[PDB]
Structures are given as structure tokens and as C-alpha cells.
Design an enzyme around this catalytic site. Structure first.
Site, mmCIF file in Angstrom:
data_model
loop_
_atom_site.group_PDB
_atom_site.id
_atom_site.type_symbol
_atom_site.label_atom_id
_atom_site.label_comp_id
_atom_site.label_asym_id
_atom_site.label_seq_id
_atom_site.Cartn_x
_atom_site.Cartn_y
_atom_site.Cartn_z
ATOM 1 N N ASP A 11 4.690 -3.190 15.210
ATOM 2 C CA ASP A 11 3.911 -2.740 14.058
ATOM 3 C C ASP A 11 2.811 -1.828 14.570
ATOM 4 O OD1 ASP A 11 2.322 -2.589 11.586
ATOM 5 O OD2 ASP A 11 3.319 -4.462 10.973
ATOM 6 N N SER A 61 3.751 -6.132 2.944
ATOM 7 C CA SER A 61 2.466 -5.676 3.435
ATOM 8 C C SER A 61 1.357 -6.381 2.623
ATOM 9 C CB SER A 61 2.403 -4.144 3.387
ATOM 10 O OG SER A 61 1.542 -3.639 4.395
ATOM 11 N N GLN A 62 0.389 -5.650 2.077
ATOM 12 C CA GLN A 62 -0.703 -6.286 1.301
ATOM 13 C C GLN A 62 -0.207 -7.156 0.116
ATOM 14 O OE1 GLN A 62 -3.151 -2.893 0.335
ATOM 15 N NE2 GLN A 62 -2.046 -2.475 -1.580
ATOM 16 N N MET A 103 0.800 -1.206 0.000
ATOM 17 C CA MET A 103 0.000 0.000 0.000
ATOM 18 C C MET A 103 0.841 1.267 0.000
ATOM 19 S SD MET A 103 -2.680 0.685 3.244
ATOM 20 C CE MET A 103 -1.326 -0.142 4.378
ATOM 21 N N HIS A 126 6.267 -1.638 11.188
ATOM 22 C CA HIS A 126 5.983 -2.143 9.834
ATOM 23 C C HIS A 126 7.114 -1.907 8.796
ATOM 24 C CE1 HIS A 126 2.916 -3.980 7.391
ATOM 25 N NE2 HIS A 126 3.019 -3.043 6.467
#
Lengths: 277, 275
Positions: free
Chosen positions: B203, B85-86, B11, B259
Site C-alpha cells: 500500500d 478504504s475510508q 475517497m 491499495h
């Protein structure tokens, strides 16, 4: 005797400093007016944040941020010319009305939407899917608190049918257009401009209606027929001084062929540069 | 003749930022000489790549990448995949949907395999797009108009409206067998040699952080979480994750940062060996 500084405000889906967009305008101006200082406004820390802030940062904050920037730049103290592209046109008008100091001298609006828009058929750039999302959001609920506050295009979304909802709920365009009441300082400050130049693109497929580029719009209560500035109540009741300005030679209505923001070097040099020397 | 690597960014990021995916690429190329790394761009420009990470339907993104991998000649012999991530759950979806060419190792770097139920902060300089997405998600994540267009909504996972989630999610609910058991999703996932999951202990982006290890909030509330191995997804083994776990195919790594915050030393030590 020096040339006046130029402040540029880009439009939606664009940044301050793309060589193919505002970069090219800056170079173009610097070649034909030597020694000119050109500030291309950036709202954000990076070019990508500048682009997403053109969709998602509250315009009233944007205007404050730009007023603070203009107050801090010593090269603009004695006054500047301003040129807005697309939504940057109505944003720079907002700056003229809200912070008249340092003095803006010529406001040049290039395909601006001064009566807003009632449709979003296409976004500039490679922005189709963000556009599709914005369009859906607007048609669904442009005037809800949560959408007004966080979506730039909602804040000059102007429904000519549900006109009274537009007046009561627009947090930007309704204010700067004196829809809710007459802010006298807005009128005073807009009238203090030497020239207010508006460029309309005759084959524009982005701005709906195209008349918004010349401060005209859909006639109230329907969405097919458009009327020019002179037939609107904003003008005839003269809430912003546009009728006093029109009569005093301060308004310039320019039209070019081509789609949104598509303008040749010949035309630009012929009709815009004269306002910048 | 080292296996090539396919990268899918997260993202608010693109294929090719020097400080982000570009740094990963240059780093993997130095440690494994002559490696072919494909950093996936879903868009004409870097700028469209970033905004597609928010507004282009994930099912359209997945079928596009699969076509793009099938047509790529250097990947026909097989490839490793690393999702950030995604990109983690996205590349898993490629593993489950597009078995040819064959993915060998799947590396999920902070992926959200049980999705999210919150969006308190977004990567990069993107706080205002994040505000808008957040408000939109908390208002109508499962309405048809939002689901079909907003990426984060397609792995938004409401534990309190679990029935609504299973019913409406057009991506996460499919790849997690929430509707029925697609027998080849299971068969395809189990064909991986290793499925590595990296969790970030500080995170502040991923809510809940255990989604990075395929865990989630207990169904019906949103305070207490439960790990992969206590969920019905693992009980009933709808994805083959239990058989993979017992076979030593699942690798769980934890690192102490926020993150996507990891050191070169830790990366060289723990990630490179799977490449």
C-alpha cells in the site's frame, strides 16, 4: 469559404463534455453552422478530473496546457474563435494575451469574471459542500502562498478593500490585468482580437459582483458600490488597450435576463451565432 | 435467501463506477445469485458523490446512511457490510452507532481504523485535489473550520500531538473511545459475527499501512508503529476488540498488492465466504 473553428472552455464545477452543459452548446453550434469544428477543452484525463481541476489546478499551468493543445491541433492553424463560460472566459482571455499563436479571432466571454470576484455565494452544479469549503478557505486566506498556488478561485479573488495585497499576491488575475506592471505583449495581443464579446447575466446569483462580467468591479477601498470598465484605471490609463479597443468598435457588451449561464436558444442564435460564422 | 450486502466506496470514488464499485457489485451478484447489493451514494449525482467523499462531514454522512438503511425494507432482517478504504471506518461507525437494523459481517478492505498521519497519494485521477487536501491537513487539520468540512481531517491522527487529536477530532476520536467510553459503541461492535480487516502489503496510499489492521504509530513519535494488540485501545478494551479477538470475531487478511489491488481468485476465495 469555411466557418472558423470554435474552441470552448468550460467554467467551474463543469467539464468539457456534459450533454446538459458544454455538450448542448456544442450541438447547438453544430446545427446552426454546419461543418464547424468545435474543440471543448478538457484539462485532465477524465471528466471527473476535469471537474476537480477547475477548482484545484493552478491556472497558469492550465493556460500553458491549453496553449500546447492549440499549437498541436491542425484545424486551428488558420485561426479560431474562442468561447469561455464563467471562469473559462478570463482563462481564454489569458490564452489570447499569452499565446497569440495560432490567432484567436473572436473571444466570446459568457458570464466571465474579468476583474475577478469578491464572494462566492453559490457554485454551479451539485457542488454545495466543495463550495462551502472553498468559500471558507478564501475568506480565511485567499492570498497565502499555499492557497494561491492550489485553489483556482483564489487566483482571481480580488479584494477591493485590501487592493495592494491583491496586487502583490495574486498569481494570475493581477498579471493578466497589468496590476503589477504593464506587459506590452499582453496589450498588443488583446488588441489583435477582431471582437471581444462579453455576456452579462442580469439576474446572476453566482458572480459577485455581476459587473465583473463586463470588466467592471467594486470601486477601490470598499465593497458595495460598483463602477463600469470605463471608470476604472485599467481603462483610463489603458494598460490592456481596452480603451483603444472600445473606441475602434472591438468591444461588445451584451446583457441577457436569467441567472448564471442560463441562456435561451432564441437569444444565443440571435446574438452569439453571428460572431461564429 | 442470502443476506444482502451494503457497500461504501472510498475517497475519490463513487457508488457506481464500472471499473471500481460497479465491478465489485457485478462480481458479488454473479457468485451469489439473487443477492441484493446496496452501493451507497452520498449525493444527487456520481460527481457529487466523489466530492462529498472529500468535503461532506463524516458524522452527517453516517447519520444519513443509517436513516437510509432503516427505511430500506430488504435490510430489516439483517445485512453484511463491506467498506473500501475510508468506507471501512465509516461502516464501522455505522456498526457502532446504528445497531438497528443489525449488521452481521463487517468487511474492511484497506480501511484506516486508527486513521492516517499522511496523504502521499489519492485513489483515481485526483492528484491536484490531493495536493490541496494534503497541504490543508499539514497546516490546520484540527482547526474548527477544517474539521467540520474536510473528511480526511476527521480521521487525521497526529501521534506527536496526540493530546490535540483526542481533544479536536470530531469522528475518529469518538468511534475509538479517545474521550470516554460510550458503552453501546462497545456493545454494538461486539454484536458483529465477524469483523474482517484486509491489509495491503504494498500500500502506498495509507500512512501507516498497519491502520488497516487497527495498528498505528507509537504515541509521541511517527517512525515506529505498534499492532492493535499492544495499543491501550486493546489493553483497556474500550471497544470490546480483545473479547472479539479471543472469541475469534476478528479476522486479519493480508494481500501483497497496493491499495485496493486484489485478484478475482483471492476475492472469491477469502471475501465471498463471509457474504
Amino acid at each position: 469559404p469555411a466557418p472558423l473553428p470554435l474552441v470552448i472552455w468550460h467554467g467551474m464545477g463543469d467539464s468539457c463534455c456534459n450533454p446538459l452543459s458544454m455538450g448542448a452548446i456544442k450541438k447547438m453550434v453544430e446545427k446552426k453552422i454546419p461543418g464547424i469544428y468545435v474543440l471543448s477543452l478538457e484539462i485532465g484525463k477524465t471528466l471527473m478530473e476535469d471537474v476537480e481541476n477547475s477548482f484545484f489546478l493552478n491556472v497558469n499551468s492550465q493556460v500553458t496546457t491549453v496553449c500546447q493543445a492549440l499549437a498541436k491541433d491542425p484545424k486551428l492553424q488558420q485561426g479560431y474563435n474562442a468561447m469561455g463560460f464563467s471562469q473559462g472566459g478570463q482563462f481564454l482571455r489569458a490564452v489570447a494575451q499569452r499565446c497569440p499563436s495560432p490567432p484567436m479571432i473572436n473571444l466570446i466571454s459568457v458570464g466571465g469574471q474579468h476583474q475577478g470576484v469578491f464572494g462566492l455565494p453559490r457554485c454551479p452544479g451539485e457542488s454545495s459542500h466543495i463550495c462551502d469549503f472553498i468559500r471558507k478557505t478564501l475568506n480565511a486566506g485567499a492570498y497565502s502562498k499555499v492557497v494561491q498556488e492550489r485553489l483556482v478561485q483564489a487566483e482571481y479573488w480580488h479584494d477591493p478593500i485590501k487592493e495592494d495585497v491583491y496586487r502583490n499576491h495574486s498569481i494570475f488575475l493581477a498579471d493578466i490585468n497589468q496590476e503589477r506592471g504593464i506587459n506590452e505583449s499582453y496589450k498588443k495581443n488583446l488588441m489583435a482580437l477582431k471582437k471581444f464579446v462579453m455576456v452579462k447575466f442580469l439576474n446572476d446569483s453566482i458572480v459577485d459582483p455581476v459587473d465583473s462580467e463586463w470588466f467592471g468591479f467594486y470601486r477601490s477601498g470598499q465593497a458595495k458600490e460598483t463602477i463600469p470598465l470605463q471608470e476604472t484605471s485599467l481603462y483610463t490609463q489603458d494598460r490592456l488597450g481596452l480603451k483603444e479597443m472600445d473606441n475602434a468598435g472591438q468591444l461588445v457588451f451584451l446583457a441577457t435576463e436569467g441567472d448564471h449561464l442560463q441562456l435561451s436558444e432564441e437569444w444565443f442564435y440571435a446574438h452569439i451565432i453571428p460572431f461564429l460564422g
